Amino acid sequence: APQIMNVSARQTTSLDGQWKTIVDPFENGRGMKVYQDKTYSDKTKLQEYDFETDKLLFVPGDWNTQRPQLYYYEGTVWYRKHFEYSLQPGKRLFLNFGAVNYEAIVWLNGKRLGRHIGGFTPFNFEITNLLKEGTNSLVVKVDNKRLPEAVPTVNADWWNFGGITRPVTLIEMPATYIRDYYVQLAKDDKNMIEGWVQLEGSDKEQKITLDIPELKVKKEVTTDANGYASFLIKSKPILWTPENPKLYAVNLASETDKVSDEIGFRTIRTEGIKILLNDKEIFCRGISIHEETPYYSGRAYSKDHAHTLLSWAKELGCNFVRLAHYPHNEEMVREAERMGFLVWSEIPVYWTIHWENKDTYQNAEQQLCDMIARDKNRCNIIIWSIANETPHSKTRLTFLSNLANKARSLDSVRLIGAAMEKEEVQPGVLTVNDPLGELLDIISFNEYVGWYDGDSEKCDRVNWTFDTQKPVFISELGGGALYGHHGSPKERFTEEYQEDLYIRHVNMLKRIPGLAGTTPWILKDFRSPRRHVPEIQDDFNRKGLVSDKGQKKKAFFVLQKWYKELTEAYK
Amino acid sequence: APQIMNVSARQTTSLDGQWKTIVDPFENGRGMKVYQDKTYSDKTKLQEYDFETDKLLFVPGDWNTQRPQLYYYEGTVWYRKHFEYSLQPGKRLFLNFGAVNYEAIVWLNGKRLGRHIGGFTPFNFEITNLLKEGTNSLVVKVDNKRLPEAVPTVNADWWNFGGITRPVTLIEMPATYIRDYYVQLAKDDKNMIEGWVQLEGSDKEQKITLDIPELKVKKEVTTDANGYASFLIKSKPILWTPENPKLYAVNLASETDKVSDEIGFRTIRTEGIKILLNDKEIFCRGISIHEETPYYSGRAYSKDHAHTLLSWAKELGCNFVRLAHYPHNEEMVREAERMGFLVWSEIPVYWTIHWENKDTYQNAEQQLCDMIARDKNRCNIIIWSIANETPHSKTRLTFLSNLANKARSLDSVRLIGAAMEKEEVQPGVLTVNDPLGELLDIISFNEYVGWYDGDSEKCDRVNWTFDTQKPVFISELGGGALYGHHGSPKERFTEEYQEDLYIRHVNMLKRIPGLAGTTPWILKDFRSPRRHVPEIQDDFNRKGLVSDKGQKKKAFFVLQKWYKELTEAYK
Amino acid sequence: APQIMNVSARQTTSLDGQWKTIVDPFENGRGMKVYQDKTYSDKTKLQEYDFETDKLLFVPGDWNTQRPQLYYYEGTVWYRKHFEYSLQPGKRLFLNFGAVNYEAIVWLNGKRLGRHIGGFTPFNFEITNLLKEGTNSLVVKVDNKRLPEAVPTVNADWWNFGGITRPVTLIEMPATYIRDYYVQLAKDDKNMIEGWVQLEGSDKEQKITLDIPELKVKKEVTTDANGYASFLIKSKPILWTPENPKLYAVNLASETDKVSDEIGFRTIRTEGIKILLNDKEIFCRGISIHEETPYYSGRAYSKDHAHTLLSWAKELGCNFVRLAHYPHNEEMVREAERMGFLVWSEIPVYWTIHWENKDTYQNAEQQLCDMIARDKNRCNIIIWSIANETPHSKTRLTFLSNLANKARSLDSVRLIGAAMEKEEVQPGVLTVNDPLGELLDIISFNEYVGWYDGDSEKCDRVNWTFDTQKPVFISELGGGALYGHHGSPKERFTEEYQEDLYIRHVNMLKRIPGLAGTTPWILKDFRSPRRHVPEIQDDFNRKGLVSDKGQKKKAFFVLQKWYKELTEAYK
Ligand SMILES: [Cl-]
């Protein structure tokens, strides 16, 4: 039931494929005990369901793009899977869900394992003692009803993709296993590897060896009664960069378990309005990215999906991606780490969260913890964001301030951010005035001058100034356009309007003092039921620089041109 | 109207996006002259269509996966596109269709440009003198009715994907332009580049400059009165291989036109049962691949699509891909060329082709000519296949003989293949007995021992022998399975059966004298209305080693293992 | 295989409900022997279909309105039904199809029963000796591909509704049964009932009694060695009329069988330009009706369907319906008989019929024979029509003259009609000029003045003369409109235009010398793939006076008003 670090490198067996399903909008399945998964063999008795003859859905996947009737579906779908597994005595078996949106209730062989809320973070159950011989029955009640107190809350600008959205994996473990570990450079120490290891089980006091063969590193330690051990190691690794995304093969071995990983090393810090990566000043040439596939625009989960998306970001000129608006699948983070993209990773705290609801806060904090705990060894991540645009208020400040201090205590290294409230200093001069800023390492905010705030011309008469000398990071900007839709640059939603907007907006950004990063909104058109223009939007946010079919809009080459200049300037 | 070489390198403007469409099963559109594209604004007259207010389809793409109503649709859809273009006087403008299945009839501003048959080859129309100031109207009537005399014919094991399936591109040329050019190693000569160039237009007698700057080549030639010029260039390029897919930047310039290309150089030849790449004996560790996308299983067209599929082929351990069953989009061939995959490229000729029909022959020969003309500079292509499985009749031999002679006349370097007829030499011993073999450079054939011919263990009881010392290429083998469906290795359509099949089949392949290549069927499950098993096939051929959802079945790793052995053996 | 008379009055058992299906667009089911209906239980064998786990369709019903994917589907669907039946020895069992469009091939328990062409006439197979104990398997291959030589041919102005479109029925008969019978008035004789009865089986020589209690009739005859007997009977029944639709209960009983029927009696003839029902001059206040259902616009088949449509025609003031464009289901003719509607019944012989194809003729003639044989006892039918609008050629006239003489040779009583070619006498004066008229009892034709031929105004300046003194019947007229679409009376497709057209058109009809009937086109909007105006037609012919959703358009009341006047005028 605790998180398991580096699931992919464990003894895994997939449960993915096609599973039997029941759509249950009035939610009578639980009263019916469908989790019992009784095949309706004996028709002399009355039963009013049968997985065995019902329809299939692909797992993993959102359900919305799989059937027209599920396009808008908000409610419960029951999923059922049969599997066999042979577990030698002593060994332990865990069931790992990469993600289920929004609520998951899980049974095995008729017995309730538990419940999970939060649609973008993984969770585990131990089924060691519940596994049986022959056919085991897994039933997952999935629900994506939008709730005011949930995180995200009811309204938000992206499709409500329900389903088992990331792979489902069985993980076999020794009776005492390496559950969690940390291996990174010490804060601001290009010469010191710091880390810890955490065992889980009964034999909690074992010798541990960390092997980094390429660095010729081989340190043995011994865990305490709590199963824990820490270490400092002197060493001078080749430091990871976007241009050379060096990763090291890292091997852990206890007396009962072993696991391999691929980990990179870098320092990251601010220095005035400078972001310094391995002591070198960098610009974050970024683009924002929803977790949505090219071409068919369902929920992304695979390395193929990540590579297509990031290959567009590479052509665009980015060294950086903002993964909005929630923790993405781990394949996305890993692929960016390998290809050489810095990452901004964030939770879906977004607008009118219920700031005074203690359950809401513990949900948000749990997502923050799970996100950081899964990816704390991914050196390409340099910013955690705890919130997008939020309304100013005392209870909002308290909520977000608790999240920020929590993040920094889980990870003393990476920068902490959050969309700050904008203010007008004087006609045509904007700034940022947020008391939360003291707990953040950067000044970051969204702005849509030229799209929501005036026409494209207004970019030419807006300037920015700041009362604190922290690096300025604009995390959203831009405007919409339909690929292949052409007209005057004065006509909204044409490629030509978007192009003119980006030409003027780039000039505005060039005047901003302290600017250290931009992640325009957005890489690729994505589904949103808030966008109603027929034939232009058709329930897509059209602010992509690339169409949902992967076609580069005119504005794409404006930003690419600027990123080339920034690449040369920061070389 | 003639083919244009290297379209992507020209001064191009995309016409892709979403187009207005009219579905017209009874084909009355031509009678009401919908090609006139009259917006129905004056409602005091009777008109019975209106593009302006009708529905959209994405271009490019099959229509089948775009709307449930078009999933099975066979018949006519009308597509309409408005565009503006400012053509400097004297310049010329061409309209390029990457592919349209099956018949395209095209109008511009109400005037018929022409007609094209064949669903997988590009075609052009000059529109220089039909272009208007202001809005231009392009109307395409696309029909995918299956015709007995067509190539392919009514029966085929893949989906009848209709529509404008590859990009639509406007191409601007100077009044006299470089239309076609050939640049490759002379046959079996690592030290001689040979080729030719063909200009189109009035100023046809011109001096041309071919630069390969990295090679320090700068050849100058003058075209004759027909605009043609050939040349021989002494040079020793680094030779393209799957391991080192070296390409050279090649710049052609006329007095008025210029075009750049990326071309590689290699020699390919047979020597007994050996295939020699740059004089080194190689094994073609291949896989077959349909032109169908991952995940949503529409018609593939993009570099994205190609990269995803080829990356699976890379992980499988292949140095070789067979692109079935027709010429694929150009992005697939270019990406295999850049990534290092040898290519087998073929035309949709198979069993029930109308061998006696001269129009069918001319169709098939025209598709062959266009295939070679488009890709003659792609050094990764080493085999042209003119036919899959075909009946053994005098008319078929005559038909395929003429195609084989035609291919060799067009391309003296690459190898020519065609699926040959098998027969039994004695119980448990197979060979091929095909009179066409004299005109082919390899002995190739399909065989499904263990799936169609017996159960998996029949592989253990079958051996092969050949009366001719030519390299043996098995261009299809395998069996079906549904990812996530498990059971006894004796149960068909389980991953276990397919894994057991590949184990024993690999062992059979290891006993075949003269085996030099294999392209199992197939990389990814693909659509086929002949595959009716519910919940297992659901109108997909299931012989992929990868599911249509990117998931590697157990058998994928059996073949991977063997390919890894073959890599080391031939290194 | 012979037709059976009055099927619903027999010992019937329904096979309707939901049947397993396989959509088979490439037609490999036959080669796969899908007609063997082998459940795919033993997965150690390779099979590529499974009825038992496939999807369902409703029978009876077109498939097109049942699934989005089948809306446009033209091709083969396999239907399977399981059933049990205990046939006591000596008794006989027939399988009856009300209609299947277009071609049906039928198997029982793996054995081919036969094949049927023509989508609108019933057909039978005797299954007495092929029935087995336990489960019986009925497999039906249904195909609606449009064929150039078919009847109807490739394009017609109504939807290509495929499937088992009318009920399927098992019929148990005695060893010798009453197969067919005729009971009507002799030609032009209110005082003589003529008839015959036809037995089937070995015991052909039998005594038979024709009981008509309400007439105190009780005639006994004895059949010859061929099972036939004719008879004449003096009687003075009450004569059926639209106003008093009097039907008599009729009972036939043989030594071993008996059947009951409901039959009316009437005389029909022409006298100059007059149509005389029961020697009384009448006007046919008609409306044309396609066999398509209210609200969901599927293929109609039930008494419910017929009653709804006929109730609309009742409200319109009609005493007469044209059932287009083919023989309708039997419920529709019987419900028209009971409610008091004269009927025009026709076969789908239209413009582009292959006049020179002997198979085409045989097909049309079988459909005509089957039409008349089924309904020869329905006294409300007064007109058989052998063609709609057909081109004037010598082969067309030979074709239709044979049908007309075949029709008259089968029915000495009812009138024969056909759409005759119009002609312009002078500017503003039309007539009919057709050599076929010499063989028709009426001058019938279609005319669309004010819709296809001019604006509504043109009706005010068009007049009609006729070279022969036969009753003039306008079998189509009208124009389109969308219910709830309003505008100027000059704007096409508004209710107002259609209202103004009917006002002026009716005033034209009032000027026509010899006019004796009108069946405007049409009662209810109906599906047609020829009708492309978005948001107005959306693949519906909009010429209905009632929307497809049962809503009465303004023009409905214009025609109702005229029909009121005609009702009073013909008292
Ligand atoms: Cl937008």
Ligand SMILES: [Cl-]
């Ligand atoms: Cl298969």
Ligand SMILES: [Cl-]
């Ligand atoms: Cl209409």
